[PDB]
Amino acid sequence: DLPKAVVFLEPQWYSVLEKDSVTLKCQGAYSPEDNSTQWFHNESLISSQASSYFIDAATVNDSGEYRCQTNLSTLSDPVQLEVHIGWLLLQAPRWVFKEEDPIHLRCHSWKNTALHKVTYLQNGKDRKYFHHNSDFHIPKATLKDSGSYFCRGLVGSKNVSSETVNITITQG
Amino acid sequence: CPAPELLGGPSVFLFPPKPKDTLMISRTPEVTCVVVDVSHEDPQVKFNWYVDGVQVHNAKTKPREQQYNSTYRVVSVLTVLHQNWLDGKEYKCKVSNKALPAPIEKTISKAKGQPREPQVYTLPPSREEMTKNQVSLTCLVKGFYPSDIAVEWESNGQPENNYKTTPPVLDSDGSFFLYSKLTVDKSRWQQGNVFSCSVMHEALHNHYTQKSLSLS
Amino acid sequence: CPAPELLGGPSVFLFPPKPKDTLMISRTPEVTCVVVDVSHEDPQVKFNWYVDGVQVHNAKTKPREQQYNSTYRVVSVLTVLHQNWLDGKEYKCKVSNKALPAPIEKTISKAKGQPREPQVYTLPPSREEMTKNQVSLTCLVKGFYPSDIAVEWESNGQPENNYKTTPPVLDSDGSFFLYSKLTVDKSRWQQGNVFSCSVMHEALHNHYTQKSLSLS
Ligand SMILES: *[C@@H]1O[C@H](CO[C@@H]2O[C@@H](C)[C@@H](O)[C@@H](O)[C@@H]2O)[C@@H](O[C@@H]2O[C@H](CO)[C@@H](O[C@@H]3O[C@H](CO[C@H]4O[C@H](CO)[C@@H](O)[C@H](O)[C@@H]4O[C@@H]4O[C@H](CO)[C@@H](O[C@H]5O[C@H](CO)[C@H](O)[C@H](O)[C@H]5O)[C@H](O)[C@H]4NC(C)=O)[C@@H](O)[C@H](O[C@H]4O[C@H](CO)[C@@H](O)[C@H](O)[C@@H]4O[C@@H]4O[C@H](CO)[C@@H](O)[C@H](O)[C@H]4NC(C)=O)[C@@H]3O)[C@H](O)[C@H]2NC(C)=O)[C@H](O)[C@H]1NC(C)=O
Ligand SMILES: *[C@@H]1O[C@H](CO[C@H]2O[C@@H](C)[C@@H](O)[C@@H](O)[C@@H]2O)[C@@H](O[C@@H]2O[C@H](CO)[C@@H](O[C@@H]3O[C@H](CO[C@H]4O[C@H](CO)[C@@H](O)[C@H](O)[C@@H]4O[C@@H]4O[C@H](CO)[C@@H](O[C@@H]5O[C@H](CO)[C@H](O)[C@H](O)[C@H]5O)[C@H](O)[C@H]4NC(C)=O)[C@@H](O)[C@H](O[C@H]4O[C@H](CO)[C@@H](O)[C@H](O)[C@@H]4O[C@@H]4O[C@H](CO)[C@@H](O)[C@H](O)[C@H]4NC(C)=O)[C@@H]3O)[C@H](O)[C@H]2NC(C)=O)[C@H](O)[C@H]1NC(C)=O
Incomplete structure (x- = not known):
């Protein structure tokens, strides 16, 4: 079989400043009860179970590798991202x-x-x-x-x- | 506009102690950090002081808000050790404010170079001047270093109001030098009252010397 | 209210004539208007000059294109009559460019307020100094207006290298004053060679006066 999530940043810029804001949507195939998405920071589960992780105020702590995965979907390849100060x-x-x-x-x-x-x-x-x-x-x-x-x-x-x-x- | 104000971090200026205050233990040298252009939207401003690189938020500080054109102004007084500022420790003032994407760091210290000896001579009015109703009692400080320094005038025991001084000038002779023009009504000169030039510098035995001018 | 200033487009600075150039008819004083940060997209910059508010497009002016960091720079030099720039006419330079919402004006004029003939006195080395290898032949210019002024030193016909001068000082006496310390090797003093201080101001008979100092 072949599912496999996907991550998209929007706005397109993968490099940004603090107080700058971004959202990572996870295009995946949901399935009964599992209308949930999981977000990984580097390689780690993190809260926000949304379908689109949203960062209002960014910050370096926020920098890292964001990958996602839903139910019927595999595990998103990484999308690296970085907050810089300036x-x-x-x-x-x-x-x-x-x-x-x-x-x-x-x-x-x-x-x-x-x-x-x-x-x-x-x-x-x-x-x-x-x-x-x-x-x-x-x-x-x-x-x-x-x-x-x-x-x-x-x-x-x-x-x-x-x-x-x-x-x-x-x-x- | 019913009053502009604006678009950039609040900027920051930091001044050193007054020369005088640096040589008279009896005096409180005080280094000073100022922050202007401080928003009404983020008046909270945070100061951190650093002696030759030390004391992030420990203490020995002092500040308090201030209105103005339409923006805030903020101060930080850091009383310092005499010998310190003498030996040349550097003073760091880190300022933080929600308006600034990051901090600002300004450092103030005393000139590089070994201090020089303050030649001091006094000068009696040029006769050509004698005519007017007040003469220019001059006294000059030559060949000293650094620029920090202050000068004054005493008649006997009490000092004078009238008189001005030039700011230090870089003499080719590597050091500094300035003048100070005391103004007294003509009479006072002739009558005889003696007059003293007072020089404060860290090269004089007691950071203090005196030289006097009279006539005949 | 304090006008909204600063929004891209080229900036414009306007410089005044050189002091000296204004007191020797033999000298061509010129006021000059620069325009930096000029795009490569709209190099065409247009000036208009106004004396005491006159001649929009008439003339008597002068300018031509110039490269840089990656932006253009442009000048206009308007020669001025001496007398004018003395009576204080005002000079206006209106800059106009595609990139600018509206045009920019910058007005430069001569020190407003009434002037005052500067008294000049010479001052012979304080005995206490006669000691050393060279003495400080001093010359002070007091009570003048305004700050503009220049001073020099000649032994007989030829001028000296060594010596320096203070910046005008704001005297309480409403005007200004400065000092000038000429340095000569001890000898020359004693020998007798006479010395003159030279002062250029717009209050002396011919904008010039001289006073001399020697031993007597
Ligand atoms: C909103 O309004 C505010 C305030 O406005 C005020 O009212 C109106 C009328 C204004 O027109 C103005 O008059 C008033 O400020 C305004 O804030 C402005 O912002 C300016 C910048 O935007 C800022 O300018 C800087 O000024 C520095 C000079 O500070 C001295 O002088 C000024 C007046 O000339 C004075 O305000 C200061 O107090 C200070 O003077 C005294 O200094 C004493 C020495 O210690 C000290 O005394 C006290 O402390 C001692 C401690 O020993 C004792 O406790 C003592 O008892 C105690 O009194 C006090 O500090 C002062 N006291 C008095 C009475 O004066 C000046 O250095 C700056 O110049 C440098 O920076 C510019 C660019 O910024 C460079 O281009 C330039 O080259 C300079 O560079 C320096 O050059 C030197 C060599 O010469 C070099 O060594 C340095 O390394 C180099 N540094 C840099 C960074 O390059 C600059 O001009 C102004 O000060 C500030 N107002 C105040 C009160 O501070 C806002 O901007 C307004 N908002 C807007 C949007 O405009
Ligand atoms: C790209 O590069 C551009 C090119 O600039 C040059 O810079 C080099 C260092 C180099 O890197 C090259 O890149 C390039 O060659 C650059 O343009 C620059 O932009 C700056 C600002 O963005 C401009 O800054 C201003 O400079 C003024 C000083 O001007 C004189 O001094 C400087 C220092 O040496 C010199 O560079 C200037 O050319 C100029 O020299 C004078 O030149 C005139 C004309 O040539 C002479 O006039 C004489 O007149 C007699 C008449 O008889 C006769 O004609 C003579 O022949 C003639 O020479 C002068 O004699 C000569 N004097 C000297 C000593 O050289 C500053 O005054 C100005 O400061 C004021 O305004 C600022 C902004 O408004 C403000 O920041 C500052 O606080 C200050 O404020 C004012 O203060 C006054 C008191 O001084 C008050 O009275 C005012 O009220 C107050 N006003 C305000 C609003 O606050 C500022 O520093 C810079 O001039 C300009 N460079 C040049 C060459 O013009 C461009 O930005 C770059 N772009 C990018 C993206 O990087």
């Missing part, structure tokens, strides 16, 4: 992009505060700059592009930046 974080889905892919860099801000003259950088070099905050796309990445990114901007008078990150341009 005024902003660099979002992206994967970090290992094939020569020519849909790069989506998001300079996100703590408690979604507002961001001024924002910048996406790398290796230390100011790549792209926006006045009011904006996501940063690149149709198809390029190998020349590989490097270590981060962004920075303005929270009122305050100035801020993200923890660096490694984008890896592969040859396929």
